[PDB]
Structure formats: structure tokens, C-alpha cells
Amino acid sequence: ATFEIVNRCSYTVWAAASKGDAALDAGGRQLNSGESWTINVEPGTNGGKIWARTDCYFDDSGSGICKTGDCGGLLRCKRFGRPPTTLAEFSLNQYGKDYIDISNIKGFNVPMNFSPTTRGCRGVRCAADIVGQCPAKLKAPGGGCNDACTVFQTSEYCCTTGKCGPTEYSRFFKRLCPDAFSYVLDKPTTVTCPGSSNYRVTFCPTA
């Protein structure tokens, strides 16, 4: 499958694409305002994620730091990034189907739209001003709005026992972005697409 990643923000982001143990395609690239980066992701990819990183500094070897979503200081991510990160999530060609969603389970940094460019499913979007509205205890100094699990590390927020309910904090993400996962056992907002669909991820789809 091919994914077009478009930076519509007025500021530069550093896109990243990983499946946790490996980079997807190059794994990461700078996107200036307006830039598109086209990547190819192998069919059958399970547990792939795409996110934006903000305020990054890399040297000439692709080593440095980002204020949100840093993946151990590399330009080209192999691992997932540090919260807060709004996440495009996908599993491709799972019994003839592609599954996509957007998740606020690891917090929110940049608004995002995740849409198919081929036929036969709708996209999903989280474009509200979550950083502006973020409750005070969740505000990350780096920029961004943390999830309650990252900040408090309780069973309840992290659903570590597999039973957990919505909370004051997850309710805030869900109120602003009803189409994004707001906690681990949220009612699924996954979208089912035909196997081998293609996609576009747009950062700042509105701005």
C-alpha cells in the first residue's frame, strides 16, 4: 500500500512511520509547510503507525531530539515515539481487510485526517484544538496534550488489568474528537477498508 503524508500545518513537522520494531519505508523525514512524502508500506503490515514530531533538531548523521514524538533521537524512526503523539494506526490485509483508526491513547500533538485515496470506506479525523483546551495536569511543556496514563501511571488510566472505564481525562479527548480512541477500551472507532487500499495522512487538515 502507498501512503501520501501531507504537512498542511503552517509549521514544519518531522513525519515518522514505524511498526514498533522496524521503520516503515525510510522511517522519517522533514516536511515543510505544504510538503507531501509518499511512502510504500509492505502488504500484510500489522500494527503500523504514522505520526508527526515537532521542534526537532538533527545533526548531519540524523541524530538529535524532538519535543514531541521523539523516537530515541533518530530522524528515521524504528520505534514508536514518546507521547504526546496523535496516531494514525493501521493493519493491512488482515483476512482480506485493511483496518485504520486515529488514536489519542498516547495524547495529542498535531491535528490529523486519515483517509483512503482508493474506493470503499470513509476516513476519520481529529482536528479540534485539543492543545488549546488541554486540562492543566495533562499539558506537556514540550507542546501537546498528554494522555492520563503517561502522566499518572495508574491501572485505571492504563487499563493494565484489562478492565477500566472512561475517565474525566479520556472524556475530554472523546468530547473534542469522538472519532479517535480516547482510552484503551474505548468503543472501537476502527474503519474497515478493502484489502490493499491506499491512503493519505494530512497534518493540520483544517489549518
Swiss-Prot record:
Disulfide-linked positions: 9-204, 56-66, 71-77, 121-193, 126-177, 134-145, 149-158, 159-164
Gene3D superfamilies for this protein: Thaumatin (2.60.110.10)
Keyword Ligase: no
Cited Pfam families: Thaumatin
A GO term from the CC aspect: cytoplasmic vesicle
Record keywords, A-Z: Cytoplasmic vesicle, Disulfide bond, Signal, Taste-modifying protein
Transit peptide among keywords: no
Subcellular location: Cytoplasmic vesicle
Family stated for the protein in its record: Belongs to the thaumatin family.
Role, per record: Taste-modifying protein; intensely sweet-tasting. It is 100000 times sweeter than sucrose on a molar basis.
Protein name: Thaumatin I
Species of origin: Thaumatococcus daniellii
